């Protein structure tokens, strides 16, 4: 049972729009919308979406394996050794949000301050004392974007496992000698940095040049979660305001995906005429080039929706029914929709290019979609006694200042983490929070395992957060 | 009664080193050390300081007025109009941490997300509806460092008032016409940006070229808080670890200031031989060039302590008794003191160049000195019933979703803010926190009105913070 | 009769290696090597080549038309209008070395100081008075590389004609309105800059992604000049020193092209065993990435000559027989060949990425191959009486300072230029020299219509230039 | 007899404005204007000047020594050793235009291609074979502006000698050890780069902060050449067009200098009322910030000619009688004077910031003032038999290809060079031209030892250059 299974199970249930069942449905955790900063729903005039992993949620682990397999074949096709074809994607290993260190070839899990929580070389997990030889402060400067790459996305999931697979292979293949910053193969030296780049490159290639999008569109039921509730919600959003799409993907892909997502013998409610996905949107924009989209942007173009190709030149006309946009900026959306930032709830999955940047750069309200969260919640409520026991040992160890406690703490931590996978929870490693966690609280006003949980709150709802107080203020 | 008075009153009391009186002294707020992230004092091996507004706390408002007067004379000396000499520094107006907008010439108080809390043009406070003509989202991109300058420091206090003084003068002088981005004087157009730069420049000039440092050193009792408790604390720090200084200031100034700060007929305790300020330090470093200091740094030089001038060339020798350093980097301190980041508690007052950067870039533990805080605390504990009434009206207005409340909220907010000054608290405007507040919590592990509050905790103390939990985790 | 015909006619003649016939052959202009700076051939220890338009000279106009046709189809394939398919490459229009002005959409011919010689909008040649509305000083800042693109190469020939074709089409198509900086198509505005970029992009695409290289290799006799004299010369070069190749092209293409160029039933002389093209080289280097090659370079890789693919990682071994290199730098060639700059005569065709940069950045001796020059010479010696008449009218107009002369000067100039084409000589427009001319003199020590003219000088030859004197020095 | 003596001797003679004596005066070399590119004087509508070393020519070696002495005292004042005070400026050593190599601490004389002509370490002249250990190709990349500083100006003359003085001192002082890239002083290491920077800095300091300008203005007869012919020429320039000034210097200095230069009991001709220097100018501009002046420039300000200080803000009014400008750009001059580039003859002395940049960036016509040239000419016409003998030995050595010649060539070269000084001619080292020479020909249309030689040509004069031909074109 993966996280995408949990979502598709909730996707298969019709929507019960009784005002009481709604209140009762969103009492269970898996249908709640969690609040990091207070949000008056009546002040939202525009609802924004990205597509990939928001409207279209890719079924795990089928889609990650397909991304892995395609990437492995691309590397082999440029001269990586054949053994890579013996690799197989293992969803139990990678947790989203790790930091790969191109200098020493380590996958690292870190907190909001760049403190090392977990270090693994290949599939070898390094313990506290042994990491200090390369990380003498148990600390990394995340700002050093030349050395450290953060695997923020679910697209990064297959490369996350791959980078481990690769380090482990070369470490243990006798044709290579291991060195501190890479592998020596007689007279070729492959640094972890160039090995990293090759992977990064081959992932890019399978999305933009290879067959990933092709093989996806030929089996959408296998790879894409469908939910008849999705047209319902969007329809209701259009009743109280405006709805727009701003995806990085291209209109041909966006047309294929969006058509499938709306492929039902009915419209928003069962029994209504079916409507084309574009009619649920007031403004459609593709090739968004996020995060550059929230700054200067790119040139605003117009799609020829028959040919799928862009019209030549810069588009200077107004927002029309039917028109589809390419490029532009976040200001394009504000100007054409007559909106201000805090009028806009922008629903997305990218913690950086969607959520952080629209908040910092524009003042947009944010809703963060976390696919895995559907499985993350399950593990949490089942294992809450372990975390409660952990909270207990911390408090007791704090009283002790008036030694076997510290070793029991590291043990219940280890056991709790493993329930989430080899790399542990998305949001923490024991009692210590992650960089990812920290970002979700700081930048995502609302968050959930799917934005469909918004169907279950009335449109007048005041999401409430607790006010933050400084130490001296309590 | 200013904040510097509160400190100098606590500075004049001898230290009562009984283990009970200590516990009892640090129960009152004004002597507590507040904790944002847990800190084991036994893990600190090195204590770091800056000087200005940390070891040497400049008496308010005497020092701000001297900085103001000198700056006003410098502007007049390059052809600003004479009326500036009629200005007089008013400590009730400026609050540290404001953002000056060089485009529209407004002083702005903003929160962690760049939300406008207070906007003032000159001395004219703009209300909510009227700000939206220049700030259509009530929002500024703080990242636009070409348009927005944040007045982080107490050195920025006199220019903060000056920029208002200036806008107000030109607005109301009939020789000028007001325009949106500056003032037109017949055929000269002075933009708020160039007016800003001139000020910024004249502040720099009085510190580095003018007579500010001179006039300070000729009346140190008037301008610098002295506390016989300061040698005590440093001595105790040297008993359990190493102590270092890293100031941006120059050795001649640092020698004058530091000598005064240690000018007592005794050493650390009354009755002990007096020691020279340098002997309380394991490593002294001047011309630190923070924040560049925590990155690549500058070249490490050696001071000729007799002449006050630097020796020629790059210093390549080891840490010696007596030697004084110039430039270098934070790695210089680690290497010479044999320390790792989390071994170091670095005590400073600059929220950016001291605290934020040593944490993000190095993994240093941080203690933030907030001078004004001594007065900020006083206003808070006296007016806690106003804030409690505010907290009450927010909760009640939240229940109301089952209109005169919203106008009473803005009224008790206004009254509370004014008690702090015309620009309100350092840390908030009503129930909404500031950018500054947000940074103190995020980057300063410990904070206080003076680092001398550390004298009152034993050296084994485990400062404790509450663990942070995500919404779904409670 | 094009220039490539003149070369292929000389290529078809066997080499007569009698010491007298050599001296007599290189007396005619078409077989001379012209000298801009003195060059002792005995001091050359290494001979360097690029490939495209040096070893492999592409037959005109067949190859330019194929590049044009392919480029036109690529633009149509991204939504340019169909009429482009009615275009046909016209070799009489473009002269290499023009400057396209992306602001006003003009092809421009300019001198060493950026003085306008010829301005054409589409196919409309603007006369002196009319250009001053956009060029008020008859001058362009060639340094403004954002506005001006110099069409240096023979690869740029088809886009040179295309950019004219395009401007002329849109100017005169009624579906568009002409404006100063581009064309308005209802609500799309196509600037000359974006139209330029699209072309630049589609040229890049046909070389690197399209079928140009494919269609070339399937008809090498149609598209590539072959000369049995080429192995002879290279063999003799290897007898007195070392010979190397450094091409931007890829090893698969370089293998196909180079094999054809050496495809003869004999080796260097008729009757000798045939040798494989690689054996004529001491060091082979592909993917050179010139001009970046003469600075920091790229990473040195090693080609797997069986698969055509690069080996993975950085190559750290020595120069071996058989090895082929990828990337690297000019220092790679010096180090492996044990050479200094002035030991190296580097033979190439790119006035910038080959010749200028190897001279300025490294101190290499340079030989510039100018394909067109074979036709340029023919026009010059036939029309020398026109140029002599021009020289005469200038001198006479200079004496006149003690008006129909100035109009006769512009008339004989016009007539002379046209003999070279619609855009005139590569090297001049009348008595005024071009930017290109100026660069050849300043940066190319030797130059010729083909480097094969070097076969006709003994290996001890001291090429001689006249010493340059300053005015006051004569 | 220095070069400034030759000028001041010509400055002391009244102007004989008979049309015959003029023709006869400019037949001698020392009063000719030499032509690098043809120039119709009737097409000049605006005459431009800088001031320092053009209108005001500083008397040698008095002014260089004063610059040296002041600079030496400034270095001593920041802790350089006392022995520097034993240095004394020696005008026989430095030639303008050398390249100092901050890596190996060598003064170098180089040609247009960065070929080493002369290398001196301190005062030790390195011969051909010995330079190849640091310069293996006898070649430097002049583009590497981090390593190489070109001493273009006469202001650079005293530092040129100083850098030698310094290297020689430290090399031979026993308190220091010499190393490849600097000097080790126990535990301080002074690199030639930092030693260079210190000098560069101390030269800047004496001009802008020290007493150089002060001590100049208190003895203008000692330090500044005065010529009553200067008002004459400018007056005649104003009769046929417009005259402007654009100096980097400040208005207070420019007022002091310019007043002295016009201090005569008469105006342009003897017997005319004296006029104030400003009235000879249509547009005066100070703080020009060349070469940035010929690009984007700085903000246009207006000087308060009574106070010497700038008015506050940006000046937006028109060109008025009496107004003085500060900053701006070259476009400011064109717009206010209604001129195009080729309308403007700009007379200056800086080969880069004046001449090269106004030509490349704007299309200005250029006149280059070369102070030293008055002495350079004298040495040349006296020693023409040595150069003729040199030209002879080169030709003979070229015939010899059908060994004591090559050693006689290096000997007559050495003897010829020394007549110019220890570093030889400005324009050559033997038969090989310098980088400086090359630039004068390429960028200065006209040049002379003083622009006063323009008085001797009528205003209709067509300066003539020989047309340049490519090898194949003769």
Curated annotation (Swiss-Prot), chains A, B, C, D:
Chief subcellular location: cytoplasm
List of residues binding adenosine 1: 152, 439
Chain positions recorded as dATP binding sites: 142, 152, 439, 442
Q: Name one GO molecular function term.
A: nucleoside phosphotransferase activity
Q: Which keywords belong to this entry?
A: Allosteric enzyme, ATP-binding, Cytoplasm, Disease variant, Hereditary spastic paraplegia, Hydrolase, Magnesium, Metal-binding, Neurodegeneration, Nucleotide metabolism, Nucleotide-binding, Phosphoprotein, Transferase
> How does its activity get regulated?
Allosterically activated by various compounds including ATP, 2,3-BPG/2,3-Bisphosphoglyceric acid and Ap4A/P1,P4-bis(5'-adenosyl) tetraphosphate. Binding of an allosteric activator is a prerequisiste to magnesium and substrate binding. Inhibited by inorganic phosphate.
Q: Which GO terms describe its biological process?
A: adenosine metabolic process; allantoin metabolic process; amide catabolic process; dGMP catabolic process; dGMP metabolic process; GMP catabolic process to guanine; GMP metabolic process; IMP catabolic process
Explain the purpose of this protein.
Broad specificity cytosolic 5'-nucleotidase that catalyzes the dephosphorylation of 6-hydroxypurine nucleoside 5'-monophosphates. In addition, possesses a phosphotransferase activity by which it can transfer a phosphate from a donor nucleoside monophosphate to an acceptor nucleoside, preferably inosine, deoxyinosine and guanosine. Has the highest activities for IMP and GMP followed by dIMP, dGMP and XMP. Could also catalyze the transfer of phosphates from pyrimidine monophosphates but with lower efficiency.
What disease association does UniProt give? Spastic paraplegia 45, autosomal recessive: A form of spastic paraplegia, a neurodegenerative disorder characterized by a slow, gradual, progressive weakness and spasticity of the lower limbs. Rate of progression and the severity of symptoms are quite variable. Initial symptoms may include difficulty with balance, weakness and stiffness in the legs, muscle spasms, and dragging the toes when walking. In some forms of the disorder, bladder symptoms (such as incontinence) may appear, or the weakness and stiffness may spread to other parts of the body.
Instruction: Note the NCBIfam families from the entry.
Output: HAD-IG-Ncltidse
User: What name has this protein been given in UniProt?
Assistant: Cytosolic purine 5'-nucleotidase
Organism listed in the record: Homo sapiens
């Amino acid at each position: 049972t993966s996280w995408s299974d949990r979502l598709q199970n909730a996707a298969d249930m019709p929507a019960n729009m009784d005002k009481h069942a709604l209140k009762k449905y969103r009492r269970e955790a898996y249908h709640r919308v969690f609040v990091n900063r207070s949000l008056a729903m009546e002040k939202i005039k525009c609802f924004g979406f990205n597509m990939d992993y928001t409207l279209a949620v890719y079924k795990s682990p089928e889609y990650e394996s397909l991304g892995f397999e395609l990437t492995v074949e691309r590397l082999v096709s440029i001269g990586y050794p054949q053994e890579l074809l013996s690799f197989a994607y293992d969803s139990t290993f990678p947790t989203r949000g790790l930091v790969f260190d191109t200098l020493y070839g380590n996958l690292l899990k870190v907190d909001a301050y760049g403190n090392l929580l977990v270090c693994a070389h290949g599939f070898n997990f390094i313990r506290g004392p042994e990491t200090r030889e390369q990380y003498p402060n148990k600390f990394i400067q995340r700002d050093d974007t030349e050395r450290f790459y953060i695997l923020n996305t679910l697209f990064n999931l297959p490369e996350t496992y791959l980078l481990a697979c690769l380090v482990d292979f070369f470490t243990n293949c006798p044709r290579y000698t291991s060195c501190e910053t890479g592998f020596k193969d007689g007279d070729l030296f492959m640094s972890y940095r160039s090995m990293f780049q090759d992977v990064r490159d081959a992932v890019d290639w399978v999305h933009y040049k290879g067959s990933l999008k092709e093989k996806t569109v030929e089996n959408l039921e296998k790879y894409v979660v469908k939910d008849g509730k999705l047209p319902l919600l969007l329809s209701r959003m259009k009743e109280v305001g405006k709805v727009f799409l701003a995806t990085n993907s291209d209109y041909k892909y966006t047309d294929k995906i969006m058509t499938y997502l709306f492929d039902f013998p009915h419209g928003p409610k069962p029994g209504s005429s079916h409507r084309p996905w574009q009619s649920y949107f007031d403004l459609i924009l593709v090739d968004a080039r996020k995060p550059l989209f929230f700054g200067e942007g790119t040139v605003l173009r117009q799609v020829d929706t028959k040919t799928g190709k862009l019209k030549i030149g810069t588009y200077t006309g107004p927002l029309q029914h039917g028109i589809v946009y390419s490029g532009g900026s976040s200001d394009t959306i504000c100007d054409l929709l007559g909106a201000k930032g805090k009028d806009i709830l922008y629903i997305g999955d990218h913690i950086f290019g969607d959520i952080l940047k629209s908040k910092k750069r524009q003042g947009w309200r944010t809703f963060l979609v976390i696919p895995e969260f559907a499985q993350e919640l399950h593990v949490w409520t089942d294992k809450s006694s372990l975390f409660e026991e952990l909270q207990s040992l911390d408090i007791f160890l704090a009283e002790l200042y008036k030694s076997s406690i510290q070793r029991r703490i590291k043990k219940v931590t280890h056991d709790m983490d493993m329930c989430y996978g080899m790399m542990g929870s998305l949001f923490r490693s024991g009692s210590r929070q992650t960089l990812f966690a920290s970002q979700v609280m700081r930048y995502a006003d609302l968050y959930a395992a799917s934005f469909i949980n918004l169907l279950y709150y009335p449109f007048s709802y005041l999401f409430r957060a607790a006010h933050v107080l400084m130490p001296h203020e309590s």
